[PDB]
Amino acid sequence: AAPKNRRTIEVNRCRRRNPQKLIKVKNNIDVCPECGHLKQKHVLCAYCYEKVCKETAEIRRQIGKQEGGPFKAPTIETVVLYTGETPSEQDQGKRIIERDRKRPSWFT
Amino acid sequence: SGTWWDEHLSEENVPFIKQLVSDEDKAQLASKLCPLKDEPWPIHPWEPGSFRVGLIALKLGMMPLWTKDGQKHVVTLLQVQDCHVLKYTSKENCNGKMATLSVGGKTVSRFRKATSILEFYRELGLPPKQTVKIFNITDNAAIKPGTPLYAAHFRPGQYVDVTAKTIGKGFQGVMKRWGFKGQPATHGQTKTHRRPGAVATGDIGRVWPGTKMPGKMGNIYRTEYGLKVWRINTKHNIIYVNGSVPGHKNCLVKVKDSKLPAYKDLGKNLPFPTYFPDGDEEELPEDLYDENVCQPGAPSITFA
Amino acid sequence: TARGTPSRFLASVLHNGLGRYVQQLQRLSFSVSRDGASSRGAREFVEREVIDFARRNPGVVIYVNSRPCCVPRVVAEYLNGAVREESIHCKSVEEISTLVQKLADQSGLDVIRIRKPFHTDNPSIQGQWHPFTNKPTTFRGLRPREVQ
Amino acid sequence: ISRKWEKKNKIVYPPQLPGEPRRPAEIYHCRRQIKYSKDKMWYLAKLIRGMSIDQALAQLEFNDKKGAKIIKEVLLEAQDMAVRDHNVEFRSNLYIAESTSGRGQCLKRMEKVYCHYFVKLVEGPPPPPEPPKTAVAHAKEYIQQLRSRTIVHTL
Amino acid sequence: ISHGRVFRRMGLGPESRIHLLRNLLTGLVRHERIEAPWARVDEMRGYAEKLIDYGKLGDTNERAMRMADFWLTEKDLIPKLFQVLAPRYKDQTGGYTRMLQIPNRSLDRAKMAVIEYKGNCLPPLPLPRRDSHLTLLNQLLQGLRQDLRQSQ
Amino acid sequence: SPTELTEMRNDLFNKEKARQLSLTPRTEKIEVKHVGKTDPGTVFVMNKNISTPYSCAMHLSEWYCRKSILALVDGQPWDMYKPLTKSCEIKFLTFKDCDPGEVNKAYWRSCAMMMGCVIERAFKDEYMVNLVRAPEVPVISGAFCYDVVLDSKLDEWMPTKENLRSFTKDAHALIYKDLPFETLEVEAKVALEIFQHSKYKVDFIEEKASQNPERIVKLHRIGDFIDVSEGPLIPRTSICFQYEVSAVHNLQPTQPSLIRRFQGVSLPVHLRAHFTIWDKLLERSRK
Amino acid sequence: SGGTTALPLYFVGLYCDKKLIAEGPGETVLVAEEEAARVALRKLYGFTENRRPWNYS
Numbered sequence A: 001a002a003p004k005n006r007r008t009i010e011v012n013r014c015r016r017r018n019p020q021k022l023i024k025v026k027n028n029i030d031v032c033p034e035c036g037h038l039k040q041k042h043v044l045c046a047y048c049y050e051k052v053c054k055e056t057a058e059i060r061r062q063i064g065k066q067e068g069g070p071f072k073a074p075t076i077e078t079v080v081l082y083t084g085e086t087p088s089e090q091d092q093g094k095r096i097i098e099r100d101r102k103r104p105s106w107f108t
Numbered sequence B: 001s002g003t004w005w006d007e008h009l010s011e012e013n014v015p016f017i018k019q020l021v022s023d024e025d026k027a028q029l030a031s032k033l034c035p036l037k038d039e040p041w042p043i044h045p046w047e048p049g050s051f052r053v054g055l056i057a058l059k060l061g062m063m064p065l066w067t068k069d070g071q072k073h074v075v076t077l078l079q080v081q082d083c084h085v086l087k088y089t090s091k092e093n094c095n096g097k098m099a100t101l102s103v104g105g106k107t108v109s110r111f112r113k114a115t116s117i118l119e120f121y122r123e124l125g126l127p128p129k130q131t132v133k134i135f136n137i138t139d140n141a142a143i144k145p146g147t148p149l150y151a152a153h154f155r156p157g158q159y160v161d162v163t164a165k166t167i168g169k170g171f172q173g174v175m176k177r178w179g180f181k182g183q184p185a186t187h188g189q190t191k192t193h194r195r196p197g198a199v200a201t202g203d204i205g206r207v208w209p210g211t212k213m214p215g216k217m218g219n220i221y222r223t224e225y226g227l228k229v230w231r232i233n234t235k236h237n238i239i240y241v242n243g244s245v246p247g248h249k250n251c252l253v254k255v256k257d258s259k260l261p262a263y264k265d266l267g268k269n270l271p272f273p274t275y276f277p278d279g280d281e282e283e284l285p286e287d288l289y290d291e292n293v294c295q296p297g298a299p300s301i302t303f304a
Numbered sequence C: 001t002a003r004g005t006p007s008r009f010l011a012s013v014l015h016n017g018l019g020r021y022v023q024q025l026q027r028l029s030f031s032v033s034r035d036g037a038s039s040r041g042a043r044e045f046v047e048r049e050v051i052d053f054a055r056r057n058p059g060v061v062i063y064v065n066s067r068p069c070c071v072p073r074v075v076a077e078y079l080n081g082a083v084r085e086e087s088i089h090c091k092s093v094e095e096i097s098t099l100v101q102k103l104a105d106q107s108g109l110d111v112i113r114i115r116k117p118f119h120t121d122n123p124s125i126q127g128q129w130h131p132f133t134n135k136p137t138t139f140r141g142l143r144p145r146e147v148q
Numbered sequence D: 001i002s003r004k005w006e007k008k009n010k011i012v013y014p015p016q017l018p019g020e021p022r023r024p025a026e027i028y029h030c031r032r033q034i035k036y037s038k039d040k041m042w043y044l045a046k047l048i049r050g051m052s053i054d055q056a057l058a059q060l061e062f063n064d065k066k067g068a069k070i071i072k073e074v075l076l077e078a079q080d081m082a083v084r085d086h087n088v089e090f091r092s093n094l095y096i097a098e099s100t101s102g103r104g105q106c107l108k109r110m111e112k113v114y115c116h117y118f119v120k121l122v123e124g125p126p127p128p129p130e131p132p133k134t135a136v137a138h139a140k141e142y143i144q145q146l147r148s149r150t151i152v153h154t155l
Numbered sequence E: 001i002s003h004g005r006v007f008r009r010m011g012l013g014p015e016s017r018i019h020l021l022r023n024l025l026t027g028l029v030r031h032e033r034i035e036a037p038w039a040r041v042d043e044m045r046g047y048a049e050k051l052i053d054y055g056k057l058g059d060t061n062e063r064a065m066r067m068a069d070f071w072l073t074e075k076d077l078i079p080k081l082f083q084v085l086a087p088r089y090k091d092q093t094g095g096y097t098r099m100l101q102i103p104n105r106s107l108d109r110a111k112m113a114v115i116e117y118k119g120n121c122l123p124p125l126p127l128p129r130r131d132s133h134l135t136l137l138n139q140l141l142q143g144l145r146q147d148l149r150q151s152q
Numbered sequence F: 001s002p003t004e005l006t007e008m009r010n011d012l013f014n015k016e017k018a019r020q021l022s023l024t025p026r027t028e029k030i031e032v033k034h035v036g037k038t039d040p041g042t043v044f045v046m047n048k049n050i051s052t053p054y055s056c057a058m059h060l061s062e063w064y065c066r067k068s069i070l071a072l073v074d075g076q077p078w079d080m081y082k083p084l085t086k087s088c089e090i091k092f093l094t095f096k097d098c099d100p101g102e103v104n105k106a107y108w109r110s111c112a113m114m115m116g117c118v119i120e121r122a123f124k125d126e127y128m129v130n131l132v133r134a135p136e137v138p139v140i141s142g143a144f145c146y147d148v149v150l151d152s153k154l155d156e157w158m159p160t161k162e163n164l165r166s167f168t169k170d171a172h173a174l175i176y177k178d179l180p181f182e183t184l185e186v187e188a189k190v191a192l193e194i195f196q197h198s199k200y201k202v203d204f205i206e207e208k209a210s211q212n213p214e215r216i217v218k219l220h221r222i223g224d225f226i227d228v229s230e231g232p233l234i235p236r237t238s239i240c241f242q243y244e245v246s247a248v249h250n251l252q253p254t255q256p257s258l259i260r261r262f263q264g265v266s267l268p269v270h271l272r273a274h275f276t277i278w279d280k281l282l283e284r285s286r287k
Numbered sequence G: 001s002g003g004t005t006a007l008p009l010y011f012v013g014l015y016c017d018k019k020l021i022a023e024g025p026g027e028t029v030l031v032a033e034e035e036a037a038r039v040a041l042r043k044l045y046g047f048t049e050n051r052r053p054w055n056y057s
C-alpha cells in the first residue's frame, strides 16, 4: 500500500540514530609491534603485504621474460637470487631467476 | 580491554598451559570419585511422596532393541558425562516450593567462561560444566555438592522424562510450522501456494494474540514424558530410553523420574538418594537389562 | 498566553511601603521633533503639561530634547535599573498625559503574569500545618501494635 | 552558498595575561562537494565525534564506507594545517571537537546528491565521557525535588 | 534449514561451482600463490589439498592422471603436479597450503584471502608471530615451567 | 608523628626540584635523533632541560605514548618523565619488543616501589614501620620482594590472608588513583644532611653513589611518598592492572630485628593474563 | 514516622526538668535535635517567627 501520513523528523531520528544502525567502534586495531603500522589482529599488515606483492610481481615479470611464452611450467624447483649472490650449494639443478637489486632485509 | 587466553603466550607456552590445565581438570575430577570417604549427608530410607535428583546426559544416537514378545522398540542412547551435583538451595530459601539441587554436566574449557562462573567452580573444586539445571527434590533427597552421579542412578523397569532444546528450523512459513493446508497449485492460484489464508475475522480490527503465523521454529525447551528405560551400561554410563528424545546428537538433555500420575509409586526399589559406586553392594555388571529385552548372546527366540 | 509567557511573583523593590514610600521612576526622557507631524501631541504636552508634571514629581528628573527629527518617544528609567520605552508618535495630549502618569505610577518590574495576588513573608502565626498537628499521643510513645 | 566555517580560523584573541590558563588552540576545516549522500556521511561523522585524532584515523582506515577515506584526508589536512599554521605543539594533541555533514548544491537528472564535511579540532586530550548516573545521584535528585514542594495555590 | 551442508553455493549452479574452483586451483598450481575472495579460497583449499594427495600416487597410476587432467586446465601444469609439488611434500602428510586474510578489496569491499602452497620460492608472506618468549607473562610462565618440572 | 614526616620530606624535595628547574638559562635547544625500525630518521628539537621523552613520543603519535614504557638514550634505560639533558639519540622500549629485558626490570622495581607506598601507611600509627630495601630479583624468579622491618612488638604476628587482601585492595586504590612516578637527580648530601629518619635505608644511601665516580643519586616520588631505587621506573601507576601481594617471609638470622619480606606479582594492562593462568601465577608467588 | 525508610520524619523535643522548651523536625534524629536546639535558642532570644513585628509607624 502507500503511506497514510508523513513521518515526522522525530520518528525518523529515533529510527536513523538508533544504536543498531550506528557504526561500531572497532576494538581490534593495533600497531605492528616491529614494523609500526596499523593493522587488525587477524589480518596482514597492509603496508607489509603491499611491499611483498611488489617484489612478487617483479620476480614474476622476470619469470615471464625467461620462460618466453605460455605453456612453459618448468618441471624443477625455482630459486631467486639477488645481486652478488652465487647459486648456493643446495640450489644447483633449480632454475635461477636473477634480479638486479639488493636482497630485501625481510627476504630470508 | 578485549583479548583471549592464548593471545600473548609464546610459541612454547601454549602446549604447556594446555597440558597443565588438562592435568588439573583430571586431578579435580578424580579427587571427587569417592563421596562417602568425604563427608556425606544423612541417607534416609525412601518413603512415599519423595523426589530424587536427576541426571544431565548427552544424546548419542539411536538403535533398535527387540523383546521376548517379538516386537521392535527403537531406543535412544544417553551418556552421562561428568554429572556432578553443584549446588543446594533450602526449602524456604525458595520460599515454600521444595528443596532444589543444581546439577551440572559435560565438562567444558575454562578459558571460555565468565569470571563469576570460574570463581564459583574454583570454590567448589571442579572444572566448569556446560549446562546447569535445577531439580526440585524433597528435603531427605539432599546430596552434598561435589558428589558425582552415574548412569546406574536409574534402573530398568521404570519410566523417565527427558527435556531438551529441540532442533532449530530457523524462520519458517506457516505450513512447515503449523501444518496448514496451503492453497492449491494451478487452476490459477497465482502468487499464493504456501501462504496463510485469512489471519483473523473482519469485524475485529486486530489480529488476536496467539495467532499462528510465520516465525522462528524449534530451539525451545520441551519435554517428553513416559519414556521407559530398557538398558543401562554401567561401564560407559549409557541409558537406553525408549522412543525418541528431543534435541540433536551431542546436546545435553535433562533426565528425571517420570512425573505422570501412574508412576508416582515405584520410586521405592530405586536407589533413593543416588547410586554411590563405593557402597560396594554386589557390584553391578557391565549391562543391566529389563525383564523383557531379547539381549544379545541369547538363543534366538521361539514361540512354542 | 500563560504557558507561552514568562512569569514572576508579586513583589516590590525595597520593601517600598514598609518604612517610607519611595517613587521608583527616577528619570524620564522626552524626544520631541520640532517639525514632524507625529510630534504634535508631544509638543502640546511639553508646551502646557510637562511643567506641572515636573512640579508634582520632584524625584523624577525630566529631560526633553529636540533631536529625533522625525519620531518621538519617552524612555522611563527606574530605581531598580529597569528601562521602559513607550511610543508617543501620533498620539493626543490626553493620551500622552495618561501614559506619562502611568509610567510615574508603577514600579519598574516586568509586566508579566503575577502568579499569586497576595505575597506574605510570614504566612503562619500559629505554626504551619504538619501531619502531627491535631493528632494525639499515647503513653510512652508507642506505635500501634507494640508490646513494651 | 555561505563560507562561514573557514572564517573561524581568523578570530584573533587578545594576548594572554601571564596568569590565566593557557587557552587550547582550535582549527576549523571543511571539505566541499563530496560526491556522497549526507544521510550516510552522518554516521561516519558521528563515529569520530568524541575521540582523539589518532584513534579517529585508526577507526577510519578500517571502515568500509566510501566516505571514510574522504574524512581521513580531511583530518590529515587539518592536522597538518594545525601544526604548520595554528601553532599547535604536538600533532597528536588534538581531538574531534565537532564533526558534522551538510547538504550540497549540484543538479539533477533523480537528484545527484552532494555533501560537505565540517570538522573542528580542539587542542588537548579527549574529555572523559560523562559517567553513568549512579544510584546515589538519582536518590539525591529525587530528594531535591521532594524538598522543593511548596503549598500550591495558597499564601 | 541448512544443517550439515558443507559445500558453499556459488556460481550459476553446481557445475559452475566446480569450474570456478577449478580455475582457482589451476591458478594456484601455476603461480603457487593467489589472492581471491575469502569464501572461494576456503572452498578451494580442500580441493588443493586432495589434489596433492592424488599427485603423490604418481604418474603411473591412471586414476590420479585422469583426476589431474580434469582439475588442471593448462596441461603444462600436470608435469609440475607430479614432479615438483607432490615430490616437495613427500614428508608432510597434511596441511600443504597456508591461507590468510588480507585487506578487503578496494572496489567491492569483499573479504579477501591469499592462499599459497607451502615451501615455494616467493618472498614470504608476513606471517604474524607470537609474543617474544622474553615478555613478562612468558617469563613468569617460564619460571612456572622450571618449578613444576623440578617438583614432578 | 609520621603525618608530618611526609611533609618534611616533600617540602625539601619540591625545594630541590624548583631550584634545579630554575637553573635552565632561557630555554636552550637540543636535537634528539630518533632510531629504530618504526618512523626512522626524525630529528626532534626539544628544550634542554624541560622536554622529556614523552614530549618526543607525543610528537610521533598517540600510539607511541600509549605503548611506550621506557626510553633508551645513548643506549641506556631512561624513565619517560625524566627530562633530557643534551643533544642525544633516542629509542622507545615497550613490553612487546623482542628483548623486553630493561622494560621488565623497570616494571618490577616500579611495582616494588608501589608496594612500599602501600605497606608503609597500611598499619596503625601506634606502630613504627621502616622500609629496608627493594631487593632486585629477576623477573624469572616469580615475584617481586620488598624488605621491611616491623616493630619488635609484632613478632607474634604472621599476617593472615584477610590482611593480605586489605594490602591488595589498598594497592589497587593506588593504581586506580593514577599518579605518575616523578624523578629527581640530586647531590648525595640530602641523605647525609637532612634525612636523619633514614635508619635502615641509611645503608642504601651510600650505595646510591659511593660506588659510581660521580656524587649524584636518583630519587623517585609517587606523590606524598619518596624512596630511592636503582633504575628507571614506568611512567604511570595505571600501567599495572593485575596486582596482588601474596604472602610474607622472614629471614632466620633474627639478631638485628625481624626483616619481614613482602612478595607481590603483577602484570601491565597490555599483557593481561587470563583468570586461571593468574591463579597459577599467584600460587608461585609464595616461595 | 517511617523509621526504616529513606524518607523518615523524627520530631525531637528538648526538655528542661519535665517541661518542654522546644520541638524540632528532621529526617535524622541528629538533625531533629539540632533544629530543636535552634528553635529553643530563638525562643530564648525573642526572635521567633511570630514575634511582635517591628513598629515602623
Ligand SMILES: [Mg+2]
Pocket: B189, B190, B191, B192, B193
Ligand atoms: Mg505459482
Ligand SMILES: [Mg+2]
Pocket: E010, E011
Ligand atoms: Mg551468487
Ligand SMILES: [Zn+2]
Pocket: A032, A035, A036, A037, A045, A046, A048, E126
Ligand atoms: Zn607490519
